Design a protein around this ligand. Structure first.
Ligand SMILES: Nc1nc2c(ncn2[C@@H]2O[C@H](COP(=O)(O)OP(=O)(O)O)[C@@H](O)[C@H]2O)c(=O)[nH]1
Ligand SMILES: [Mg+2]
Length: 213
């Protein structure tokens, strides 16, 4: 109406950290949010994920883009800011406030050994040697978020997730969905007025967990 705010949720993650499960759960709770999955976009597609993001932020309808890519490498976050900042004036008028929220899927204190152990067994449980090999490449390129310097200092806010083996029958992606919701209620009350009920979060996560694409 007068000064609408849009949000782009940028994961920093490697394969199998739970990005799509968490974003699917969120989309299941908030059907108006736009979940754009890089895995669904051809490498020779006319519109790539950055183009599809801006297109999915034009209407007064569309406030949230779930940007579903690993962005394990620093340059992959730089691309997002530069490309979107650079094409924003093509589509959005000067009343649109755009915020980038990092969703950090890999704790600061996690070792590569435990990162590998958790994500690899998630994904195995499709030549086996080449799925392993692609996962390794995203880990080799992984540069932890560093909001003290370019480009990560352009984030408006960071949400720190956990990456654990499941304990006490609590999947860490479900723990992570709750963190994101609690964080948004606190720090962006206009995005989520009041929480979904706990059982609706559980059911929406159950839907995401048992998704067989
Ligand atoms: N054990 C466990 N598995 C999970 C969790 N979250 C997601 N998964 C599963 O791990 C696999 C990959 O997760 P996905 O969300 O696709 O990871 P992405 O590659 O980051 O999208 C899927 O089979 C999920 O069902 C979790 O918290 N615990
Ligand atoms: Mg995925």
């Amino acid at each position: 109406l007068s000064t609408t705010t849009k949000y782009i949720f940028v994961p920093i993650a490697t394969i199998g950290c739970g990005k799509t499960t968490v974003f699917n759960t969120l989309n299941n709770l908030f059907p108006q949010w736009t979940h754009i999955q890089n895995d669904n976009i051809s490498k020779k597609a006319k519109l790539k994920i950055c183009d599809l993001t801006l297109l999915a932020l034009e209407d007064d309808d569309q406030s949230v883009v779930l940007f579903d890519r690993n962005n394990s490498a620093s340059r992959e976050r730089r691309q997002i800011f530069t490309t979107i900042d650079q094409k924003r004036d093509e589509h959005l008028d000067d009343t649109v406030d755009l915020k980038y929220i990092a969703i950090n899927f890999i704790p600061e204190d996690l070792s590569e050994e435990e990162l590998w152990d958790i994500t690899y067994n998630r994904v195995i449980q499709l030549d086996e040697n080449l799925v392993e090999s692609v996962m390794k490449g995203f880990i080799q390129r992984y540069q932890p978020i560093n909001t003290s310097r370019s480009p990560d200092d352009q984030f408006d806010h960071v949400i720190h997730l956990k990456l654990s083996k499941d304990e006490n029958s609590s999947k860490s992606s479900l723990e992570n969905v709750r963190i994101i919701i609690d964080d948004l209620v606190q720090n962006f009350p206009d995005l989520i007025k009041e929480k979904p009920a706990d059982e609706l979060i559980n059911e929406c996560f159950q839907k995401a967990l048992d998704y067989k694409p």
